[PDB]
Enzyme design. Structure first.
Site, PDB file in Angstrom:
ATOM      1  CG  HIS A 130       7.295  12.084  -5.228  1.00 34.66           C
ATOM      2  ND1 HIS A 130       7.645  12.003  -6.556  1.00 34.66           N
ATOM      3  CD2 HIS A 130       6.438  11.062  -5.000  1.00 34.66           C
ATOM      4  CE1 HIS A 130       7.032  10.972  -7.108  1.00 34.66           C
ATOM      5  NE2 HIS A 130       6.300  10.381  -6.183  1.00 34.66           N
TER       6      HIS A 130
ATOM      7  CG  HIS B 171       9.534  19.532 -16.162  1.00 34.35           C
ATOM      8  ND1 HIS B 171       9.516  19.178 -17.495  1.00 34.35           N
ATOM      9  CD2 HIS B 171      10.625  20.314 -15.993  1.00 34.35           C
ATOM     10  CE1 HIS B 171      10.541  19.745 -18.108  1.00 34.35           C
ATOM     11  NE2 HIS B 171      11.231  20.436 -17.219  1.00 34.35           N
TER      12      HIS B 171
ATOM     13  CG  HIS C 113       4.434  13.472  -9.951  1.00 36.77           C
ATOM     14  ND1 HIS C 113       5.194  13.583 -11.095  1.00 36.77           N
ATOM     15  CD2 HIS C 113       5.292  13.635  -8.909  1.00 36.77           C
ATOM     16  CE1 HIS C 113       6.458  13.778 -10.759  1.00 36.77           C
ATOM     17  NE2 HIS C 113       6.542  13.820  -9.439  1.00 36.77           N
TER      18      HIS C 113
HETATM   19 CL   LIG Z   1       9.262  13.996  -8.134  1.00 34.11          CL
END
Ligand SMILES: [Cl-]
Ligand SMILES: [Cl-]
Ligand SMILES: [Cl-]
Length: 268
Positions: free
Chosen positions: A119, A65, A96
């Site tokens: 993040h 992911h 991301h």
């Molecule tokens: Cl995250």
């Protein structure tokens, strides 16, 4: 999880059907309308203080992911919106990104998306004994978000990007000798930020998260983003699910309703 539940960004069950917290009122990410942000002079009472140090015990993983860079909680964050005297330890960095340069970030600013968002995930060691105990709890988790454009090489991230080849598939990990999260912060004189309360952007999607979004972006090179764009969501040789291409990319959650939330700015 052990019952065959895979989640992702392509085809699959709506997250809220399996992760109840995803149905909350105060989810992330969001669009940040800069004009609607309210200046809060109290964010300057104690200046936001990222006290980061080099990490020499750091593992990089592809969990299907995202890419996680797992650190040691030695680096710490305090001040700004965080409760007075509380120490938030840096646990890891997650990434991301998009398949094309026009998208990839989770948050948007005035409806503009960026090629990447990273993040810096911290947990409150003043209130909780571990990051696992802190998830979903008041003042338990604080995340610093950096927007990332495409431009000059990011030297600090080369330690990660040059090993992405080694972790192309889900479940692969790589130890690296050295990573310095200081390199992920804007210059000390370019640290305007916004703050709002929301959730994890991935399952379980728990709330209680304090988001600190820096106004000034980092930059990585085209080569660097291309390495990320080769990553895969599954183990090598897996049969692709209907509707899915096996590529890990555009791994952003859609923006969520602001609801009644106040977005604050630490600047005028
Ligand atoms: Cl995250
Ligand atoms: Cl989905
Ligand atoms: Cl290859």
């Amino acid at each position: 999880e052990e019952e065959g539940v895979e989640w992702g960004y392509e085809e699959g069950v709506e997250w809220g059907l399996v992760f109840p917290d995803a149905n909350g009122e105060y989810q992330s990410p969001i669009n940040l309308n800069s004009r609607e942000a309210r200046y809060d002079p109290s964010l300057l009472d104690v200046r936001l203080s990222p006290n980061y140090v080099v990490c020499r015990d750091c593992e990089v993983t592809n969990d299907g992911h995202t890419i996680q860079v797992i650190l040691k909680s030695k680096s710490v964050l305090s001040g700004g919106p965080l409760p007075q005297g509380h120490e938030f330890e840096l646990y890891e960095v997650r990434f991301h990104w998009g398949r094309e340069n026009q998208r990839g970030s989770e948050h948007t600013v005035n409806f503009k998306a960026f090629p990447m968002e990273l993040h810096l995930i911290h947990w409150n060691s003043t209130l909780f004994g571990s990051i696992d105990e802190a998830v979903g709890k008041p003042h338990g988790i604080a995340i610093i978000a950096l927007f990332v454009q495409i431009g000059k090489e990011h030297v600090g991230l080369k330690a990660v990007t040059e090993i992405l080849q080694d972790i192309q598939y889900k479940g692969k990990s790589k130890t690296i000798p050295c990573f310095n999260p200081n390199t992920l912060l804007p210059d000390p004189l370019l640290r305007d930020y916004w703050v709002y309360e929301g959730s994890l952007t991935i399952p379980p999607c728990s709330e209680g998260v304090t988001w600190i979004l820096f106004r000034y972006p980092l930059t990585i090179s085209q080569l660097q983003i291309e390495e990320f764009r080769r990553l895969r969501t599954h183990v090598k040789g897996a049969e692709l699910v209907e509707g899915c291409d096996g590529i890990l990319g555009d791994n952003f959650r859609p923006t969520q309703p602001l609801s009644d939330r106040v977005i604050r700015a630490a600047f005028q």
